[PDB]
């Protein structure tokens, strides 16, 4: 989508995975989906230099809206949970130098069961533009057919442009299209700033394995189309929570960088290990995700429970990631010919590799003839960055 | 097994999960199964007060032996990897105040492919007793029938007593009996200090889930036989490595305690997060595992992705463990009537509950009538200990 936006993969925070559809502010006023929660996440994104580090988009997901529409046919925030409404919430967020996402659904309802947008795209866009929204996540629950779905996504996309406001448009289109026929990715790219491809993420290594595995098994399909203004979305960063171990969290952050994926954390910024904050804010790592070139990485090699992934960067740099998939034993040793690495370009004649993760130790100079030996952790990843002599 | 040993569940360290069958001391001298490894683990068990904390058995698993037997028909250490042999290694360990485990296999071979003990039980026991072995793990690979397997386990047990030395006898008997018929647990209890019931553990929550689930799906069978001198073995502690998050590691430690399991660590004592150490050495928690009573705990309640486990202790105490099995969202609240707890005894009339894990906060006094409210982390467990007013 050529709205001149998402020129690099969007970074921000999205409530869904961690905060789900919680409507109880009796007994749990803390996880409750309410302004006080966004207002507090906003307040914090500033304090702990998430914003400094590049996360700009405070995103609301499903369950913000009241049971039904008002008198004019418009949506509204839930009266009791967003007493002040969105215009004001937006307002507040902006003031802290941030940007606001909201969520809606192509069909007759959101996935939560709340009002959908079928028949209302024109009006609904306007509302959003009106409130000062900066990003919209459109979901695909509850709709007739692929015909309709395909049209809603398009029609909504058009509408948002018509409102004349910059709004990052994040679509769940492709996901809903299987298994009814592969999606035309070039089509979607023309309408969406980014798109959800596979299942939902939850707090598990299983989840992560399977997203990686699927993105992996499907690369020709998707790796090529990705580029400035239109990214593949493998889903949120769950680093921070309860499900993944350290090496597994590095596996995520490393592979979301290789993937030129958007980076929306779903976690609780109010209680977060300080080493999860460390990872999630790694400059060099974020820079890889954010590489201005925008070419999406891919899986090079596979087998003996190891995976090799690599991504071309600007200035003849590359990122390489080695995952250990063996969930037993201790850290394993792995070696590749530095020549079979960055297409055979990076390290001809000479190479400068700094390991970025899990540590950031500079390894030396590597000859075109040289081999890279490295030790990987069970379920972890080694992420390296390569430079040239040139 | 009435050898007056394992009167509480054995604590030590076993190489297998973390170190597996690693024979390359060329390129990996550090994981290589070698005396230097045990020597060094021994060295460290003392330094970092693993021994202080209760872990006493330094255990060798598969792959310590030479390709075949010597001239007299005895086993022998691999010449190159155990230049000094076992008698000396044993010796060294004892001096540090520790006890030495070894591994052998009922059939024609070990699982690694190395020499089995079919036809050699009598001699082989003697060899072990000779070296100063304090524990034997007998495995069940490569043998004809249940007929034979059943006999080897018995015969070996007999033989070890005959040597006249104290040797903890750790059997893999029941495991090799399915799916060929349920095992007679009373029978096994007469010959083994403890026994492996389910599949092998690896570094994953999957593994942990599935052991828990299976032990749980099978309690009547096994829960009741366990007592002093004869324990159910759900396999090693993998806390310390790469696979499990914090809350998952607490789930293991808590649950292995409830399960009156032996505690054999398989991790690298040389590189270990210092908060994995904390947990692994939690006195209070260790206590529960070692409760002198020796009644094994069990799963009380189940569902809505929660689990309730409890164990009777001495002096009318009980441990309760609550597991949150839901791998999405945030921490959940759970409540039980304190009355429905320790069979209804514990907290009649009154109750003193201190949470042991994941923190060790004292909660108040609880009335017989009282409810326990608690909040569990996705994939975590809350471990509570309950005392009486009496």
UniProtKB/Swiss-Prot annotation, chains A, B:
GO terms for biological process: glycoside catabolic process; glycosphingolipid catabolic process; glycosylceramide catabolic process; negative regulation of nitric oxide biosynthetic process; negative regulation of nitric-oxide synthase activity; oligosaccharide metabolic process. Keywords: Disease variant, Disulfide bond, Glycoprotein, Glycosidase, Hydrolase, Lipid metabolism, Lysosome, Pharmaceutical, Signal. Changing residue 321 to G: In FD; uncertain significance; decreased enzyme activity. Gene3D superfamilies: Aldolase class I, Golgi alpha-mannosidase II. Changing residue 25 to Y: In FD; loss of enzyme activity. Changing residue 296 to R: In FD; loss of enzyme activity. Changing residue 248 to E: In FD; mild; does not significantly affect the enzyme activity but the mutant protein levels are decreased presumably in the ER of the cells. Galactosylgalactosylglucosylceramidase activity is stimulated by saposin B and ammonium chloride. Belongs to the glycosyl hydrolase 27 family. Catalyzes the hydrolysis of glycosphingolipids and participates in their degradation in the lysosome. This is Alpha-galactosidase A. It comes from Homo sapiens (Human). The gene is GLA.
């Amino acid at each position: 989508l050529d709205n001149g936006l998402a020129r690099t993969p969007t970074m921000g925070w999205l409530h869904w995975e961690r905060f789900m559809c919680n409507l109880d502010c009796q007994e749990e006023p803390d996880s409750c989906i309410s302004e006080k929660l966004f207002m507090e996440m906003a307040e914090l994104m500033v304090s702990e230099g998430w914003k400094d580090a590049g996360y700009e988009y405070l995103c609301i997901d499903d369950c913000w809206m009241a049971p039904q529409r008002d008198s004019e046919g418009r949506l509204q925030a839930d009266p009791q949970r967003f007493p002040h409404g969105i215009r004001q919430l937006a307002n507040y967020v902006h003031s802290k130098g941030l940007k606001l996402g909201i969520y809606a659904d192509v069909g007759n309802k959101t996935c939560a069961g709340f009002p959908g947008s079928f028949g209302y795209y024109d009006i609904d866009a306007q509302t959003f533009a009106d409130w000062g929204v900066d990003l919209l996540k459109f979901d695909g629950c509850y709709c007739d057919s692929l015909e309709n779905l395909a049209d809603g996504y398009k029609h909504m996309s058009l509408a948002l442009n018509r409102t004349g406001r910059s709004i990052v448009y994040s679509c769940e289109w492709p996901l809903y299209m299987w298994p009814f026929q592969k999606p035309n990715y070039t089509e979607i790219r023309q309408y969406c700033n980014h798109w959800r491809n596979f299942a939902d993420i939850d707090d598990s290594w299983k989840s992560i394995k399977s997203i990686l595995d699927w993105t992996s098994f499907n690369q020709e399909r998707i790796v090529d189309v990705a580029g400035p203004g239109g990214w593949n979305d493998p889903d949120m960063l769950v680093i921070g929570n309860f499900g993944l171990s350290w090496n597994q969290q590095v596996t995520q952050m490393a592979l979301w960088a290789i993937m030129a994926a958007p980076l929306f954390m779903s976690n609780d910024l109010r209680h977060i290990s300080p080493q999860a904050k460390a990872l999630l804010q790694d400059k060099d790592v974020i820079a890889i995700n954010q590489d201005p070139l925008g070419k999406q990485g891919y899986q090079l090699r596979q087998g003996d429970n190891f995976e090799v992934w690599e991504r071309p960067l600007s200035g003849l740099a590359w990122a390489v990631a080695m995952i250990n998939r063996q969930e037993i034993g201790g850290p394993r040793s792995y070696t590749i010919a530095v020549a079979s690495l960055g297409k055979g370009v990076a390290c001809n004649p000479a190479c400068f590799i700094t390991q970025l993760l899990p540590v950031k130790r500079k390894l030396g100079f590597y000859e075109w003839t040289s081999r890279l030996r490295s030790h990987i952790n069970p379920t972890g990843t080694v992420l390296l960055q390569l430079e040239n002599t040139m």
